[PDB]
Ligand binder design. Structure first.
Ligand SMILES: [Cl-]
Ligand code: NA
Length: 129
């Protein structure tokens, strides 16, 4: 599923991400835009052999099992394919574990390079939330 901007904002809000660990909703919408272009089916393979999955491009080295990332942890205890669903619940629940992990949203490279320090409230402007 390719989400619309306000559609995703509202789904993320319903799943408890607005101000989760201090990060306003706009931060999460901005991260999803630049990680996956709002496409739940996005995958990208990394040089180390791991793969990033879904709307928030969660990585198979630490967070999910894709059966082909040797010596990976599966800290969200899910198959990575579950992160590609049109229902974002699994992605959101795993993202909450990531962002609690210590370096916050800096775990998402696109957030650090393209969202951090910008006017992220713009990503939810105009939406009925
Ligand atoms: Cl933080
Ligand atoms: Na893994």
């Amino acid at each position: 599923k390719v989400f619309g901007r306000c559609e995703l904002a509202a789904a993320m809000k319903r799943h408890g991400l607005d101000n989760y660990r201090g990060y306003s909703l706009g931060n999460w919408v901005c991260a999803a835009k630049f990680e996956s272009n709002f496409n739940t089916q996005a995958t990208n393979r990394n040089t180390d052999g791991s793969t990033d999955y879904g709307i928030l491009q969660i990585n198979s080295r630490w967070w999910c099992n894709d059966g082909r990332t040797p010596g990976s942890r599966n800290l969200c205890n899910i198959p990575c394919s579950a992160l590609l669903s049109s229902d974002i619940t699994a992605s959101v629940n795993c993202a909450k574990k990531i962002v609690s992990d210590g370096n916050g949203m800096n775990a998402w490279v696109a957030w650090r390079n393209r969202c951090k320090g910008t006017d992220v409230q713009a990503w939810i402007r105009g939406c009925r939330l």
